[PDB]
Amino acid sequence: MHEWALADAIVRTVLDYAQREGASRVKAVRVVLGELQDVAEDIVKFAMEQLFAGTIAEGAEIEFVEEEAVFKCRNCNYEWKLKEVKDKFDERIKEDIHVVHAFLACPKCGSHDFEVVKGRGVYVAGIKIEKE
Amino acid sequence: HEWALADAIVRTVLDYAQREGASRVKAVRVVLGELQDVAEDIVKFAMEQLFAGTIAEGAEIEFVEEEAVFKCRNCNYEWKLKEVKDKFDERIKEDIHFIPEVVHAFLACPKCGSHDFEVVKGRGVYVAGIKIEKEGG
Numbered sequence: 001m002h003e004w005a006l007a008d009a010i011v012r013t014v015l016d017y018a019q020r021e022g023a024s025r026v027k028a029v030r031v032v033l034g035e036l037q038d039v040a041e042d043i044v045k046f047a048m049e050q051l052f053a054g055t056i057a058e059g060a061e062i063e064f065v066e067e068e069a070v071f072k073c074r075n076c077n078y079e080w081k082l083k084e085v086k087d088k089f090d091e092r093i094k095e096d097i098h099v100v101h102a103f104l105a106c107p108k109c110g111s112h113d114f115e116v117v118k119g120r121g122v123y124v125a126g127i128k129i130e131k132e
Numbered sequence: 133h134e135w136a137l138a139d140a141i142v143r144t145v146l147d148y149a150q151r152e153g154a155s156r157v158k159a160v161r162v163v164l165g166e167l168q169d170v171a172e173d174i175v176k177f178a179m180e181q182l183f184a185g186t187i188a189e190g191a192e193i194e195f196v197e198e199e200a201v202f203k204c205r206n207c208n209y210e211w212k213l214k215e216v217k218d219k220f221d222e223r224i225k226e227d228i229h230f231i232p233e234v235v236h237a238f239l240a241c242p243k244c245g246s247h248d249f250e251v252v253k254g255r256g257v258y259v260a261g262i263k264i265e266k267e268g269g
């Protein structure tokens with residue numbers, strides 16, 4: 001596992017703060033992840049939520065945010081973002097004479113005529129409210 | 133294209149608090165399709181504006197993507213994009229020219245060539261914010 005060590009840190013970081021703050025409960029925790037992380041966020045929630053159990057961090061809304069990736073060159077000082085790199089690479093996959101018919105046709109038969117079972121949908125999967 | 137999408141939504145939400153006799157809307161989870169080209173931050177911005185002054189004001193709004201799933205109306209075959217996308221990946225990774233071209237495309241600086249660069253924002257996961265409650269005095 002690569003998502004536990006990630007929750008042990010983030011769960012120790014959160015309980016170290018609340019403790020040195022004399023808090024009665026941790027309500028929310030925002031986490032930022034570099035777009036370079038190959039981890040699955042829901043496993044981290046699984047792990048976090050589980051590690052908070054029986055602590056003042058129980059029932060703490062957990063949000064995740066991505067931290068765009070960027071790097072700098074010491075020798076030229078040219079600073080750049082990941083994206084630039086992807087296109088420079090993608091256009092060397094274009095020299096491979098690569099692909100279109102594959103993304104536009106059912107893999108089983110030649111097809112090329114289909115239906116969108118799940119795709120362009122937009123509903124409200126859930127609402128959290130308060131009553132009396 | 134959102135001022136509407138966000139309207140059908142605020143209506144569904146605020147309608148739900150009506151037939152429920154709720155005092156406040158805490159959070160809203162919205163599922164969008166990856167085939168829907170809509171700016172997510174706008175819809176959120178538009179939802180917040182429509183929520184201002186109502187009982188849903190300041191409600192956390194999480195967004196969830198709904199993968200695409202196609203059904204061939206010729207052989208009745210269903211398939212998820214991650215199976216046609218992940219394949220170019222598996223067939224592009226095989227090539228000999230890959231591991232060596234991955235290096236020219238990543239471990240390089242477009243500016244010179246170099247191979248010695250430093251990372252600013254990327255690696256690492258860091259707690260950006262922790263909300264608490266205190267009773268000190």
Ligand SMILES: [Zn+2]
Nearest residue numbers: 073076241243
């Ligand atoms: Zn450079």
Ligand SMILES: [Zn+2]
Nearest residue numbers: 106109204207
């Ligand atoms: Zn088919």
